[PDB]
Amino acid sequence: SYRKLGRTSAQRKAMLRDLTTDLIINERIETTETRAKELRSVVEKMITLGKRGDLHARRQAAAYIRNEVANEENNQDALQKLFSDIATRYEERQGGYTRIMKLGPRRGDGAPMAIIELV
């Protein structure tokens, strides 16, 4: 199965897409846990595409991700960062490119927040 997250198909795709880009950039983010659970899959998936490094994969990942900067002083974007840096990071690992450490809840929502990382 898969979650809905209180959103429509389109705007959850947008959520997950933005979040993937944000995570690729920052290498760590705090969100809700459920959003993280749903990221984990697709994020490792894009990492598989990076490990492939083919142009077909480049165009797939471009179809997904957003056109943002990931490193100033380099004119680098999230996509280049993904392939180059992260595939060079994880040549050798087979899946499990993430960690999800649960945090406590939030003051306004009571929502269980959690951070997510690239390990």
Binding site: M101, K102, G104
Partner: protein, 53 residues
């Protein structure tokens, strides 16, 4: 679709029995001691599973 009678204190309390809060699933922070949720991060130690963020 309305109360035919006013509810008495006794039944009001009998209803509000289960209306209560359980405590959390609590543990210490082995790093700097204080308490913590299970499977979750020590906000003050900033630590988890013997690892600092």
């Amino acid at each position: 679709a309305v109360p035919f009678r006013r509810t008495s204190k006794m039944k009001k309390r009998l209803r509000r029995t289960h209306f209560k809060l359980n405590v959390p699933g609590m543990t210490e922070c082995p790093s700097c001691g204080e308490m913590k949720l299970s499977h979750r991060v020590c906000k003050a130690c900033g630590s988890y599973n013997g690892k600092d963020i």
